[PDB]
Every structure is written in structure tokens, then in C-alpha cells.
Design a protein around this ligand. Sequence first.
Ligand code: MN
Ligand code: MN
Lengths: 700, 244
Amino acid sequence: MEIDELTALGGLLHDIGKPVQRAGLYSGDHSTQGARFLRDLAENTGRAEYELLSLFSENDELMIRRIKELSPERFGLTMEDVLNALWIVYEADNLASPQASRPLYSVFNPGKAYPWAELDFEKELPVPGDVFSIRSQDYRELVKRLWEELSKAKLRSDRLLPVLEKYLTFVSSVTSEGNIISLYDHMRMTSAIALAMLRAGCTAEDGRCRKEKRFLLIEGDFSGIQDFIYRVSTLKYLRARSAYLELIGWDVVLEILSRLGLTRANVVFNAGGHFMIIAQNTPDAVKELEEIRAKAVEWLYREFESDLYLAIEWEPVSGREFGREGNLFAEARKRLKHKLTVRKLKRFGEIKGLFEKLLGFGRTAKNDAGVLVEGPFSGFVPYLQGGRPVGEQILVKNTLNPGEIPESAQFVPYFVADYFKKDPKGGVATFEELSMASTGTRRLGVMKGDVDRLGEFFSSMDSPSKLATASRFMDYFFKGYIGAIIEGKFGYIIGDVPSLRDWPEEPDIVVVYAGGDAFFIVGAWDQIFELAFRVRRAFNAYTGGKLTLSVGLGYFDERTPIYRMADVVSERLDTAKDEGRNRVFVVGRSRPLDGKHKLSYEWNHYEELWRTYAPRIYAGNGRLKGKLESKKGLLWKLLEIRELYVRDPNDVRWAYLTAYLLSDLFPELVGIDTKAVERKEPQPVYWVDGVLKIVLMAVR
Amino acid sequence: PKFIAVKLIPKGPFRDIPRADTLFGAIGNAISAIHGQSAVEELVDAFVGGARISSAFPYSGDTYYLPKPLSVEPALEGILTEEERYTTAKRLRKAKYLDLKNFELALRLRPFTIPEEIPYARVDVPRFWEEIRFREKSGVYFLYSGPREVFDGYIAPAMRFLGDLFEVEFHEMKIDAPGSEYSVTLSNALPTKTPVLWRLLRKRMTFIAEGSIVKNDPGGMERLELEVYVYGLTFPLGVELPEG
Ligand SMILES: [Mn+2]
Ligand SMILES: [Mn+2]
């Protein structure tokens, strides 16, 4: 052991006594019961280092003696060193911040709470439900799985984080009412703040690390992502650019972790090309950050002209500013956000010459055999099933299980939403392959979705551990579960959505990107139209119905360029958010320009309109309701009649005409809705085109 | 300062909104055919000698639009006093152009509002490429600053000749801009110093975008062989910056 690895693993196990107390195995208190777990685990398999980490769970009298009992030399540490580690880890627990069955209350809805289950994207969708008290029986089976995994784990933070995340993610850090924080997040945030204090140099303090600015909030946001990806000369390439921006991001984050001597625990989040790191406020750190920042920006300019920029800024911060005093953390994030907005308005100001089959990737040197693509710092060798992993760090895809890689490799698990319809060949489907598989008109569906007021949501979080949970769960819906929603899972939880066909077993969809709080997805226009509502329902369930999406849908000719498509759906998503939020841009629409008529629909408003009109004119699977075969012209005459309401909204001609046009079918349009006249809202006729034009597209 | 606003009344649709480097490039090309080079060397000299033309901006009835100065972007947290500060601040951040009235406020970091409907629309017809559909009595204009002899002598003869897709009239136009060490460019510029706030503009030259902030930067012109001159001079109006 060294003092660095000890404090890291220390703060990461200060609260591994909470799962065993509630299991009720040892005599009593978690601080005591946590020591009797690690000391017990140390003896079995016979790994001495666990009995040194057991002290963290607990007038300095009995402690100095219990440390002296243990050999500090056997490992290669001082006694004075281990006292600092314990006092550092003790305070860290405070900075990251009752019954033995209370579950984890959802960050999204503190009123609702999570049923005990271990993190698995393949099975089930986390839905905050009723406050079901967790059995002491359940915590025992958990601790028995935790025991077995920790035994075979290689006692580095990179092999210990993956097991703590698997098991202790859906576990209340404290068992109070409306407790938001996951245990794993509180454990990884303490390991972060603790190691930050050690590197900061501060020692024997009990407020030189608390009231003194010895921490750095490092925040790095990519700018020009949209341009870098959706502005080229195919879908394969478009996918490759998204994957490459991921590896570039990891390369910069891992270099900051490497040179500051930190661990992945110090990464508060890395999602949507936006990363945050807690670190030390040493003259060494600020100097090393400037060198990393400078070289990263310079590489990005040589490689991609001015297309893709990386804005890296850091704010010095005290222990005070990690919590509440009358929200200092949010205000400290706000000062740093401001620093970023200015840096993004100084694109490449750090360059003066300006104004004159695989499982993952191995992070090796640039000059190395089999390097497929290069980052600003390192090269990336693909890691195949039958191959051997090559590099100091190994980025492994969609597993927390290290698998079969060397014991001397830094394990770095990365999740990427990468669902795709396979061709008649092993390769991914093209825009033509997807556009041809559509019910009716042969068009490519493009949908761009974004979570509403996420900036406000994250800004409400008091503590690092609150933000840690908020960010991880948020990112995990998109990276983890959008894969599942496309496959066809959560059918009960979603339910009846606007659809034009029976959901396929291998859907003609291709994820371009899904991560952070956003997605870009292409496929058969009708399958994309349905996925929009599936994703939104799953999202309403995944949150406590307390957060909303906005979506922009587009249906184009297969031969349309990516940049026009991306431009249209972006414009349509921007409208959806601007016309109030929690709404979808379903299709292009004619409207009066009197400022009373919106193009986007409220999700529930549209879902209600589909429920009402679709069954009366649509049989399903591309066919028109048997009663309308040869009476289709009626639907066009309705669109024709609606267009007269668009020309002048006040004139009633439409109400009387529609009447003679029909008779039973569409009783909603033959009248003059006076609630709409009162509330100064559009007449029902205005909204019909959202349903008809989709049906008319499906029946060609 | 007060300027001569060259208004382009569009007889049919446009292909781009032509920024200052392409305006001068067209004014220069017209002078080559109409008067020969001796008058191009003289047109360049007049511009190195202090004369300036803005980029082209949107035209509507009696309303003149200008580029949102980037100086406001970090100072949005100053013209507030959450939802009414989250949503607007974003729609202010996205807003590309301002009315003359709101633009004059933006320079002083006073509270201002946004143009509701901008009087041009980028239609992209497939066959593909796009045009610009203008509203009724709506078009594009650019400003000229400097001597009268050079406008009547070089610019005005060049612009009528270019019109022979548009017709041309010009008016006087006052912009009440604050006195400051810092200025906004109403022209895409090739900077000599390092600017204050900016967005980069790729064309191969790297320009500073319209609305970017500079501290006593005249920009500069560039001569090269393919002789042709690339216009990268600043059209500076004084701007007040926030503390940061
Ligand atoms: Mn969002
Ligand atoms: Mn987003």
C-alpha cells in the first residue's frame, strides 16, 4: 500500500458497514459492524490489507494502539500517515453529505422510492414506486454477493468501484424519509474529496481543509459537437464520429486523473461531452491543468481546424462550498459555469498563431502497433473477443465486470447506447435500408430528444453525492435503457402509444447518439414516430412523472443529407421547448400567425387525439379502417376544410362545411367549441392534421 | 456615430446574406471591370486610410436589424432581477440580430428585448441548395463610414452596377454607441491583436464573426496570388463590457 491508494480505498469503504447492520449479522453499530466485516474478510483468502481498511469505519487513545497493533511497515506506511488517512476520510464523509428497512427515495421524486435490485440494464427498468420496506433477508443475500466479489477483486479503486456500483447503487446512504443519495455515489464522492485533501497536502486538521480553498471544481465542456458530427461531405461514419468524440473525452479525463494522481471516483460525471472532476488546489495541479488544457486545444485545432473545441475551466473551492449554509455548491457551480461561457466565447484563445465484434479499447502510446484512432494524449487499440488488451488503461464497453484482462491494467467501464438494425450482412443498416422498411411512404424517421430544465434540476442538488446520483441515473436512462425500449421491453410500463404497426422483434432503428440528457435516433419513419412516445412514457416512469422530454420528429427522403435533416429536427425540437416544454413536434403544420397557435403538441394532448381519431379511420399494419376503403378522399377534404380555418380562424365556414362533408364519424369537428372561444385557444379542427397526415403517410 | 446605410431592395430572392469580405470582393470586382485596377488600388487605399463597410444585415419596412454584440452573452446574469431567467437568457443567447433600439441598449448592458419575427426565411428547395425569401418592403443593408468623395466615387457606382437581382437606395443612419476602449465589429474581421470575446468563422481564412468584441483592432486586408485583396477590417462601435 501507499498513502494515496489507502485514503482512496479508505473513503470508498468508510460506509461499507451500513449494508451489514441492516442485514443484522454482527453485534450492532455500522461503524463497529463495518470493521467486523473487513477484518473478517481480510482473514478469509488471507489478504492483510483489508484489516488496515477496517479502521476507517470507526481521545485517539484506543485507535493509535489498534493501528500500532497492525504493522504499518509490513505494507510500507508511517503510523502518523494512517492517523491522517482516518481523519481525512472522516471529514470527507461530512463533506459529501431512521429505520433499518427504509428504501432509496428517487432523486427525481423524493415522495416515491426504488425497489431493491442490483444494477442490470438487461433486466427491468428502475421505476420509483411505493415505499416498500426492504427485508433484512434481502440485505443478507446482497452482503453475501458483495463478500464473494470483494474476495476475487484486486484491491485497486478501479476493480473495487465496479462491484460497489453493481450492488450498492439502489441502497439508501441514510435511511431517513425522502433520502435522495445512493450509497455508491456517497462512497465514490468521499473517496474523491478524501484523496483531494491528501494531494492538497492538508493534514492534522479538525478546519484548514474545510474553511480554506484547498479543492478544485474542474469542469470541461466540448463546444461545436453538433457541427463536428452533423456537418460532413453515411450513417456508419456519423456513428464513428460519435464514438470517436467519446474516446477523445475519456483521453482528456484519464490524463487529468493520471497527472493529478487521482482516481475515477474523482469524476463526478462524464456525459454529453461534459465532464466534472473534484481535485486538489496545489500550484502543481493548476500548472498541470494548464499544460493538459493547452495541448488538448492545440491537438483539436490541428485535427479538426476550428470545428470541435474543448473549454476547460476550474474554480478554487472550500469544504464549506460542498453543502448548505442558510446552497453554496450550486452557487460555486454557477461561478464555474460563468467561467466556461467566457472560455467558449474565446475559442482557441490558447493558440496565438491563430490570428496570423470488439469489447472495448486499450489506451497505449500514440506510436504503437494496431492503433486505430488517436486522442490528444494517447492512442486507442481496439480490444476484440479473441485478442489481448494492450495499454495502461483499458476502456471496456457495457460491463462493470473486468472479464479476462491483465491484473496490472486500469479498468475503465464506459456505457454507450449503440443499438442498430443489422443488414442481411453483419454490417449496420443504411439510410436506404431503414427508409424501405417503413409502413406506407418510404421515408427515414429522424428524432432529436432533450430533457427539459435539467440545468434547474442539477442546480437544486445540495451536495456532491446528490449531484453524483442525479447525473449518473440521468445519463444511465439514455446509455443503459434506450437500448431496451427499442428492443421492445417495458411493454406494461409504457402501454398503449401512438403506433402504425405491430412492434417488430428486430426493429429498423439505429441509435446515432444517446447519453447525458439527449438522443439522436434514425430509422423507418413510422417505427421512429412510435419510439418517440415509447421513450417519453419510459422517461415519465423512470422519473416520478416529475421530469419531461421535448422531441423534434422529421420524416425525409432517404437521399436527404444528414446536415439538413439534423438542422430541421433541431429547429423543430427548439420550437417544442420554446412553445412551452413537455411537448413533441410530430409533423410539419400550417397555422394562423396570430400567436395563439403552436406547431408542437403536449405529449398527453397528442396521445389523447391519437386514442380518439386513429381507431375510427385506421385498421392497423398499413391498412385503412374497412369502412373507409374507397372513402379515403374524406380525410383529404377534412385537411382541405382545416386549411380554411388556418386562412382565417374566426370565420365559422369550416363548422358548417365539415357538417355537409359528413355523418357520425368526427362529431368533434362539426361543432363550434366555445371553451376554446372562452380560453382563447384553437378550435379542435386545428389539431386534427397531426393525426390525419401520419395515417395518410401510413396508408400509401 | 452616423453612417450611410446602403439599402438593397431585392428584385427577387438572394443566395446568401453577404458579409463584408464578400461585399468588398464584389464591389472590388465591379470596379475592376468598370474602371480598371488603378481605382481598385485607390479603393483599397481609401479603406486602409480609414473607410469601412459593415456586413449585410436584415431589412424590414422602417426597421434596421444589427448583430447581437457578444459582450451581453456573459452579462445575462446582470440584466435579470429562474424560469423567467432560464428561458429568456437562452432565447437571448440564441438571438442573432437586434433592432437598432435594442442594439443601442445591448452596447450599454441595459435591459433589452428580441425581434419576434426576423423578416427573412432560408427556404432549401430540393432537386440541393437554398435561397432567402424576403417579406414585403423587407431586404438587406450594409453601412459605409468614411469620406463622401469615396462613396460617390467608388462604392455607389459599383453597387448600382452590381444591381443592374436588387435595386439600391441609401439613407443617413445614427447609432448611439457608448464611449469605450472596447468596440463591436459590424463586419467579419481578420484581427491583428487577440480579441476580447469572439466566435470564429471558417472560409482558407479564419475570420472573427460579426458582433465580436475588440480593444483598438482596425483588422487588416490581405493580398495574395491565385492580385486579389481579402477585406478583414473592423467596423468598430464602442461597447460596455461587464466585470469578468
Ligand atoms: Mn435539456
Ligand atoms: Mn442536451
